[PDB]
Amino acid sequence: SDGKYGARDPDTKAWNGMVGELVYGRADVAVAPLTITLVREEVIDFSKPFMSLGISIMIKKPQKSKPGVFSFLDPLAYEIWMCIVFAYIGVSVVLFLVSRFSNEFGIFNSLWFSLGAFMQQGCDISPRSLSGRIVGGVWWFFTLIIISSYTANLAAFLTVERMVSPIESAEDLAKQTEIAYGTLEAGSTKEFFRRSKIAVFEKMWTYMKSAEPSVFVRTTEEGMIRVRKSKGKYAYLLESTMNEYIEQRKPCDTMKVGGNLDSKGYGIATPKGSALRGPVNLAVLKLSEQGVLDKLKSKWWYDKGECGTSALSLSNVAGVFYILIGGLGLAMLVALIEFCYK
């Protein structure tokens, strides 16, 4: 009638929800996901637990980071790649001028010499004169620094990228400020956090109390939306059972991570002085041991669900193959043009 789980008011002992209907006795028994407490055990008689639960972590699922088709030109910025081309022209033109003056270095050959130096593939002909040698030496000094800077920067890029750890355990949460974490406004979760006498979960709640925006969310479903909106900047703590179901049903952008923190179990309740305790309690044990619950839990979660080597990849280099093919395409066209001419 009420729609609540079960709670008594502090003034009048008026029990609302599922347990309230049981106390005076409108119904015989109840089968609902309801946790066991010392407070609840007095007024209503709880049976043996059937499904165990715990508090776990929910973050935004790391999306499949498809590497850029040109993600091999990342080390050097775009304005550098521009100035290498400009310099390459200016070097050849100057070389061409000072080489032949009233020489093998023609307009075609001087252009071929400059590329051979940068690519590091030796040379056919060396500059003979003093004027040609001095411009050749500086272009050699330019090449050696640009190449070695590119190799070292790419070495640094891959070194950092592989030594990163995702937020795995509750200890990782305890030592992080960039990724925020908050619970519901009121419940059994926050109440546990206040009188928590643990290792570094006392420090966890110490941070939770003082935040810039309000970390505590009123609604649970709206709290799941806040994790989506942040996109790897907020984590929402809740029960494990609810967390696993949220990954399966609805658009996939969430997942469970780490082990369970708290210990709590659901149960089946009927008011004390009931003769129904006998056969029901043993039936629960009959279902669990044979494996009725475990098959049934597999069905509604997974079966009725709508979700589901660290070398250098091909995709990272893929781009440079397109340059190779396009070059050979032009090569065939040049052969086509000068055959019709002659």
Partner 1 sequence: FMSLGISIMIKKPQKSKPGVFSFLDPLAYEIWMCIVFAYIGVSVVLFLVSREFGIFNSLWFSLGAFMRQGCDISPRSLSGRIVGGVWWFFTLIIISSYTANLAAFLTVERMVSPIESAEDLSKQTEIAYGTLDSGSTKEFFRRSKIAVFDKMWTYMRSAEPSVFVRTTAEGVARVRKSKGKYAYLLESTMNEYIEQRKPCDTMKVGGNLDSKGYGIATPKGSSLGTPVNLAVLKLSEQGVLDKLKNKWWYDKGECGGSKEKTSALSLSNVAGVFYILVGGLGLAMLVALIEFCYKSR
Ligand X SMILES: NS(=O)(=O)c1cccc2c1c([N+](=O)[O-])cc1[nH]c(=O)c(=O)[nH]c12
Binding site per annotation, positions for L-glutamate: 33, 35, 40, 188-189, 239
Q: x-or-dash pattern for ligand X, window 33-72, by CB under 6 A?
A: xxx-------------------------------------
What are residue 181's DSSP bridge partners?
A: 235
Three-state SS for 127-157 is CCCHHHHHHHHHHHHHHHHHHHHHHHHHHHH
d(CA 44, CA 22): 8
190 vs 226, beta carbon nearer partner 1? 190
**What are phi and psi for residue 136, nearest 5 degrees?**
-70, -35
Which amino acid type is present at position 119? M
Site for ligand X in 235-294 (CB under 6 A): 238-239, 241-242
Q: Does 32 bind partner 1 (CB under 8 A)?
A: no
Q: Sketch the per residue contact string, 141 through 180, with ligand X: x for CB under 6 A, - otherwise.
A: ----------------------------------------
Q: In whole angstroms, how close is the CB of 46 to partner 1 at the nearest point?
A: 9
- Element containing residue 20 per DSSP (H, E): helix 18-24
Residue 238 and residue 222 in contact, taking contact as beta carbons nearer than 8 Å: no
**Which positions ≥6 away from 218 have C-beta within 8 Å?**
184, 185
From ligand X, partner 1, a copy of itself, none, interface partner of 162 (C-beta below 5 to 8 A by class): partner 1
**Interface stretch with a copy of itself, choices 9-17, 90-98, 247-255, 326-334 (CB under 8 A):** 90-98
Residue 166: other Cβ atoms inside 10 A: 10
- Least spacing, CB of residue 180 vs a copy of itself, in Å: 25
x-or-dash string of contact with ligand X, 94-133, rule CB under 6 A: ----------------------------------------
- Contact yes or no for 241/53 (Cβ under 8 A): yes
CB 270 within 8 A of CB 280: yes
Q: Which residue, 39 or 252, has its beta carbon nearer to partner 1? A: 39
How would you list the strands of the sheet with 55-60, edge to edge?
Answer: 180-182, 234-239, 55-60, 254-257
Q: Among a copy of itself, ligand X, partner 1, none, what binds residue 241 when CB lies within 5 to 8 Å by partner kind?
A: ligand X
Minimum distance of ligand X from residue 257's CB (angstroms): 18
Does position 22 interact with a copy of itself (CB under 8 A)? The reply is: no
Q: Does 196 bind partner 1 (CB under 8 A)?
A: yes
Instruction: Assign residue 43 a region (left: φ > 0; alpha: ψ between -120 and 50; beta: otherwise).
Output: alpha
Among 199, 211, 252, 283, binds partner 1 (CB under 8 A): 199
Residue 239 interacting partner from partner 1, ligand X, a copy of itself, none (CB closer than 5 to 8 Å by kind): ligand X
**What's at 22, amino acid-wise?**
L
> Which residues, in sequence order, are CB contacts of 225 under 8 Å at separation 6+?
none
Among 90, 137, 187, 326, binds ligand X (CB under 6 A): 187
In the complex, the residues that contact ligand X under the rule CB under 6 A are 5, 33-35, 187-188, 220, 238-239, 241-242
